[PDB]
């Protein structure tokens, strides 16, 4: 279907504790596929996914020197902002950037973009039109006006519509196979003390991928919309994820409640009950 | 990264169309072509620029470029020349990536001599 | 009405005598400064680009050994040493890292006498 290539960049300063830490992470369809950390010994632009190891050392050297160069401009920007905001040089700060494009199954551009953030707050963004900017405060206006006066958007656009796309095309060919991987969840239910006239039933789903999943409880066909306990889908630390949901049902009435699990990997939405 | 200008010198009458060639080389998908002027005083002066990602030829003053991406050519076209245009025209391309940006690569230079009428 | 102030404008010196050039930025909108050499054949070549106060760097082209430092947000220096042939040094300023809008100063014509 649709795909996208993005780059998440962070530049964080460590006042009088060395140079700022620069990290550029690359994603394809939300899957990290390349990375560059400056705090690594002899920094290199490492391939994060196997299907990437099929690129020539020429590419790896190119992208490494690109990052190093960006790491430099960023080291400068940090100081520039420091002055836009009149902030002590002694405090630490952060610049984050998100750049990339999202293309449709037709291979056409659906949305390109570039957003900046300073200390966790949106700084400036490139608009839908890929021609204008939107500043989020007095400081960003300066960058805005400069970038207007320099044609930055035009150059940036040129990258989002072309360079960025073509490379998304190339990465996908070498790794679509892998990007299709899917792991169906395994589910079981658990009964819990919960002292009183009630009990807790926890519906577990583990070892699944992608992280997208939905867990829901039912009482004799009708669905439960209240007092459902859920936990943010979490990484099992082995490529797969896990998540659970629970409800405190009146004791005895265990059977009357059933759990449901929907996941693109499953051939069909499994149904759990808890079996004594 | 070999921007070259073959013409050592060009002497032509005023009010005449003169075209100064410049061939270039770069691997970068995006880049920028430039044309500067130096006078007897010894000062360089920016004239016009070209953006690799614009299919149309740039235009400023009476200067015009014949950008031909497929043939890596980007000559300068000075129309209705005059006694002031006479100077040395340099052709430059900004390109390498990272340690570039402000690193332009200039050509050997071509001296234009605009001969008056009387 | 000019962006940079380059000094000394010219210099006559016996081969080998070291020379100190200085460049002054008269506009905060072009903090990206660089050094360019133009040899006696009129050929321009890039030397350095120092953006931050404190940045030092050396390079050696045939005929001269250099050493440039971005002393302050407004002062960029250069130290020409072991000069064997003439050359004129150009100081340049640009709005940002990308460049594409670099203005050349008047230069520092150095002559070997």
């Amino acid at each position: 279907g649709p795909h996208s290539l993005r780059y998440f960049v962070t530049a964080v300063s460590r006042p009088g504790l060395g140079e700022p830490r620069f990290i550029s992470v690359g994603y394809v369809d939300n899957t990290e596929f390349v990375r560059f950390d400056s705090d690594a010994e002899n920094p290199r632009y490492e391939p994060r996914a196997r299907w990437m190891e099929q690129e020539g050392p020429e590419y790896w050297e190119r992208e490494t020197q690109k990052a190093k160069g960006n790491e430099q401009s960023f080291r400068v920007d940090l100081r520039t902002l420091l002055g836009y905001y009149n902030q002590s040089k002694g405090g630490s700060h952060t610049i984050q950037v998100i750049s990339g494009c999202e293309v449709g199954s037709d291979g056409r551009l659906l949305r390109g973009y570039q957003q900046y953030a300073y200390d966790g707050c949106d700084y400036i963004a490139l608009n839908e039109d890929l021609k204008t900017w939107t500043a989020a405060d007095m400081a960003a206006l300066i960058t805005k006006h400069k970038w207007e006066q320099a044609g930055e958007a035009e150059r940036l656009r040129a990258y989002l519509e072309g360079t960025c796309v073509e490379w998304l095309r190339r990465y996908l060919k070498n790794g679509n196979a892998t990007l299709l991987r899917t792991d169906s969840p395994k589910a079981h239910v658990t009964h819990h003390s919960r002292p009183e006239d009630k009990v807790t039933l926890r519906c577990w789903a583990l070892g699944f991928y992608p992280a997208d999943i939905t867990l829901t409880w039912q009482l004799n066909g009708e669905e439960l919309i209240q007092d459902m306990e859920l936990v943010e889908t979490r990484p099992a630390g082995d490529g797969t994820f896990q998540k659970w949901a629970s409800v405190v049902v009146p004791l005895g009435k265990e059977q009357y409640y059933t759990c449901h699990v929907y996941h693109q990997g499953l051939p069909e939405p499994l149904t759990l009950r808890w079996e004594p | 990264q070999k921007v070259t200008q073959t013409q050592t010198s060009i002497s032509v009458m005023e009010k005449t169309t003169v075209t100064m060639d410049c061939v270039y080389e770069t691997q970068d998908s995006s880049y920028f072509l430039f044309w500067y002027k130096q006078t007897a005083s010894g000062e360089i002066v920016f004239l016009i620029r070209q953006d690799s990602y614009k299919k149309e030829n740039a235009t400023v003053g009476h200067y015009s470029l014949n950008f031909q991406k497929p043939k890596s050519s980007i000559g300068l076209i000075i129309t209705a020349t005059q006694i002031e245009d006479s100077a040395v025209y340099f052709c430059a391309m900004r390109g390498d990536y990272g340690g570039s940006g402000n690193k332009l690569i200039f050509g050997t230079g071509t001296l234009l001599s605009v001969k008056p009428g009387s | 009405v000019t962006l940079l102030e380059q000094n000394p404008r010219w210099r006559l010196v016996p081969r080998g005598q070291a020379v100190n050039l200085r460049c002054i930025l008269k506009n905060s909108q072009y903090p990206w400064m660089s050094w360019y050499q133009q040899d006696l054949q009129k050929q321009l070549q890039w030397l350095f680009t120092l953006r931050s106060p404190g940045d030092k760097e050396v390079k050696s082209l045939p005929g001269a050994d250099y050493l440039a430092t971005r002393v302050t947000d407004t002062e960029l220096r250069l130290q020409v040493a072991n000069m064997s042939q003439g050359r004129t040094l150009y100081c340049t300023c640009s709005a940002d890292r990308v460049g594409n809008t670099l203005y050349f100063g008047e230069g520092s014509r150095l002559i070997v006498v």
Binding site: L81, T143, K146, T163 | - | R97, V98
Partner: peptide, 8 residues
Amino acid sequence: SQYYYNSL
């Protein structure tokens, strides 16, 4: 392929 980021 990464973008050549400019200055803020």
